[PDB]
Amino acid sequence: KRKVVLAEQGSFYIGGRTVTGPGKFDPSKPVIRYSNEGATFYINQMYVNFQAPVRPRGLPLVFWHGGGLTGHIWESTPDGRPGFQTLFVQDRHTVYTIDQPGRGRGNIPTFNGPFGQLEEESIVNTVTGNSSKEGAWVRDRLGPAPGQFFENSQFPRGYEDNYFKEMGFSPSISSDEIVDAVVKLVTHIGPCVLVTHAASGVLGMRVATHAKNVRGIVAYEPATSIFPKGKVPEIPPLADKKSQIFPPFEIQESYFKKLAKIPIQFVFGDNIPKNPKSAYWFLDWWRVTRYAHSLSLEAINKLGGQASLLDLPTAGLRGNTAFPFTDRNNVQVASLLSDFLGKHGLDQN
Amino acid sequence: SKRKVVLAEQGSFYIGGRTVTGPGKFDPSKPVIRYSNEGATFYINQMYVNFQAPVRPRGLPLVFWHGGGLTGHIWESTPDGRPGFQTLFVQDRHTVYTIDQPGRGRGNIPTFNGPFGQLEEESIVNTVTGNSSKEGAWVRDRLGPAPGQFFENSQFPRGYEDNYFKEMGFSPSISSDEIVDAVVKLVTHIGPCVLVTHAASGVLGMRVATHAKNVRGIVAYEPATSIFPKGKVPEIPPLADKKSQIFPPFEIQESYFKKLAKIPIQFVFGDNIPKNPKSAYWFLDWWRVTRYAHSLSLEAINKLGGQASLLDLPTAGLRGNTAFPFTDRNNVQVASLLSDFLGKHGLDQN
Ligand SMILES: COC(=O)c1sccc1S(=O)(=O)NC(=O)Nc1nc(C)nc(OC)n1
Ligand SMILES: COC(=O)c1sccc1S(=O)(=O)NC(=O)Nc1nc(C)nc(OC)n1
């Protein structure tokens, strides 16, 4: 189950821009300590890894990690089982995994000075944000409170340290620049399928509207809904009657309609409440967020699309967290992704 | 195919690090976003590790450790897309580990809710960062004597400059002790292994070996900081500008330094390091004196009974290598010399 035969593998950087410091660089002057004088800095570039099987079939898959993550989540589970990278190379697809700008091997744009500041210009904010272990526990629905697990959980219990160690902060890079890097990758690859997660859900939807080479999207537990500009439906607050979900992203309808040209599937795990849950903020957040996504998919279908919502429990899989592709039943989750690719001819040459 | 690779298994994991905690308690009924330090536990300073194991490995696993401001990408592929040492050594029947050290790449960058690196009143890492420029890295890596210029003999993959410089970035001020600690813990997990280091990781790998008997050999590409027994740093001249110096050598207790005499150690240097003072080109002159300091470090190890050697690639007939010989155009020939070292000491046998 672990063996993999690669026709080729490797990695590369793509995307990004340059910014410059004042003055001119003099090679006769001390180069250390590093200074901004005469400096050119490459910023906001993306890291890309690929593994190609012998005799690929169908389209390459681009796996795009969620917020605060890296391509690690597609390589292995926290307990060391094969991730989707291995499983899909075995399924005869070329697999790309990225570390988006600002994450992992992608660039973090900082210089000589306070974090993110190049002389007088703020490239990214000096003040950061980052989830705690406790916040991520409830966000990912391991259980209702830190330390607790839902009954029949598919989380790899005992590997909490491994799991939380994979997560971290992201600097305040413009989402436009993150989308731009992936558009450039899609142009380089050719026709492909995006597989997104959490924060990358909305970003992958945006990429597809700019890149006809995106031939399909599967989004695991996307975090932000998307609608045509001025056509956001009524969405209730959370059960605390104070909080809201993430403000839906609005795009021009001419771009939104591109989403109707390709098959799109949103995948949700288990333990999202049907009814208001005022005691557990992130559980209720998921209830309302999933509802908003259902309306987003309906809007795509009203433009002639083929957009679906797969709740894993309806397919017979119980206990999944917000990372179904690293849960204990991730082979079964992968089988459902293979089913989607096959139905839509994305596994054929 | 030169590009084909057969893996018995591959994967990645996190190892090492500690935790820090914010004030107060976490209440799951209160808004979790925007994220707060209240009731927060943060995992910090952990390391990312990738492994690829061939079918029927022969010899010891290799642990490739990137230089300063880099990641494991440099062992995966060259900037022009040719196979890196990860592929070459899995093809040479070694299990290959590649790391992103704490503070780099997929390793942790310890920051929270607040100014960079600050957890309430505690500074975990500095808010003020440092970072090389393209121009500084060009001359540091000896692509040529000045930015935009190549040595005539260069092995650099010209035309892929943007790709190359895009792989580099800043490092937060994590203590070197905590970086060494993470790799010691990895070596404990792996068992007997060989460290292959580069530039800033050279001195760190030397330190790891003094703490971890599982390190059975070291090959260091263009190490940046020399190491000596405490109180026994030899006289090292200033640079040709008469004012600058090389990196202050790291000093360790002699009982630890002596552990370096128990394993084979090779330092590998590329080309275009001047023999004579060169005041017009600061980093060329810096490499001249740094290489000299390393020669004295290796001699100190050998006087204690060691097996330490310096390989200048031009003496092996390879001309034009930069400070990243393992991504240069002749990196297959560089890899052959690494295979030769492993074979000489039986590190390629079970
Ligand atoms: C891995 O988990 C995530 O990725 C998820 S899932 C629910 C929440 C989160 S998260 O951490 O909160 N990330 C984000 O989705 N980040 C984010 N945050 C804001 C305020 N706006 C936007 O864009 C609209 N994205
Ligand atoms: C590939 O890049 C490097 O790795 C190299 S090589 C020559 C120089 C460099 S570098 O940038 O300067 N790195 C470091 O070696 N980092 C570093 N820098 C200072 C000021 N002190 C200490 O501590 C001993 N380490």
Numbering used by the authors:
A (entry chain B): 12 to 360
B (entry chain A): 11 to 360
Give the published text:
SulE, an esterase, which detoxifies a variety of sulfonylurea herbicides through de-esterification, provides an attractive approach to remove environmental sulfonylurea herbicides and develop herbicide-tolerant crops. SulE catalyzes the de-esterification of a variety of sulfonylurea herbicides, such as MM, BM, SM, TM, TrM, EM, and CE, to the corresponding herbicidal-inactive parent acid. The structures show that SulE is a dimer with a lid loop in a domain-swapped β-hairpin covering the active site from the opposing monomer. SulE shows a similar catalytic triad consisting of Ser209, His333, and Glu232 at its active site.
